[PDB]
Amino acid sequence: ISSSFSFGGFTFKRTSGSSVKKEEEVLTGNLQTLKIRVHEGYEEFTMVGRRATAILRKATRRLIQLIVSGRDEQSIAEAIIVAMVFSQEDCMIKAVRGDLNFGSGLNPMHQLLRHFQKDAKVLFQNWGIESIDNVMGMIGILPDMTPSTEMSLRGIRVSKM
Numbered sequence: 001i002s003s004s005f006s007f008g009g010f011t012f013k014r015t016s017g018s019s020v021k022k023e024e025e026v027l028t029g030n031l032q033t034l035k036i037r038v039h040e041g042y043e044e045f046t047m048v049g050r051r052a053t054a055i056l057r058k059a060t061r062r063l064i065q066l067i068v069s070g071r072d073e074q075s076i077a078e079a080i081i082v083a084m085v086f087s088q089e090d091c092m093i094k095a096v097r098g099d100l101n102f103g104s105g106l107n108p109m110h111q112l113l114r115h116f117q118k119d120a121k122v123l124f125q126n127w128g129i130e131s132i133d134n135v136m137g138m139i140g141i142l143p144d145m146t147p148s149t150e151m152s153l154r155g156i157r158v159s160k161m
């Protein structure tokens with residue numbers, strides 16, 4: 001199991017928890033079957049990139065929290081997309097529209113990744129929103145990337161730092 005690695009342009013370091021991997025079949029929003037290696041366990045990570053940084057808390061196919069800071073709207077969105085994919089949420093697999101086609105060297109995680117970096121509107125619209133507590137140093141972010149002190153994309157918060 002890996003504890004430091006790169007994915008989606010970010011450097012990940014596990015800061016607590018553990019996991020195991022299990023091959024599973026999942027069904028996209030277009031009813032295409034993918035085989036992915038699902039991580040089971042609660043883990044926390046730092047994600048660091050050129051234009052954004054985050055703390056990610058995740059469990060088995062579940063994003064628990066993402067606290068993200070970044071240079072601008074597009075950079076923050078890029079980090080959110082990678083976190084959503086990395087979480088392996090079925091919500092995210094079901095947000096695929098059309099087929100995921102072959103590319104040499106691209107495993108299904110990177111197929112998903114490629115798909116949503118092209119256009120994340122369906123992912124953002126179908127992920128879920130939640131009411132948020134007013135917690136110091138954080139704010140919500142809505143599907144359309146606007147700030148909110150009242151609501152947010154589920155599990156997602158934006159920090160200054």
Ligand SMILES: CN1CN([C@@H]2O[C@H](COP(=O)(O)OP(=O)(O)OP(=O)(O)O)[C@@H](O)[C@H]2O)c2nc(N)[nH]c(=O)c21
Binds near residue numbers: 001043
């Ligand atoms: C969802 N992931 C993915 N991941 C690790 O992220 C790494 C990068 O994912 P990737 O590029 O799909 O993997 P790669 O090295 O190409 O192969 P593979 O995904 O099959 O391991 C892999 O080592 C993978 O096991 C994880 N590592 C931990 N600890 N916890 C996790 O939840 C996850």
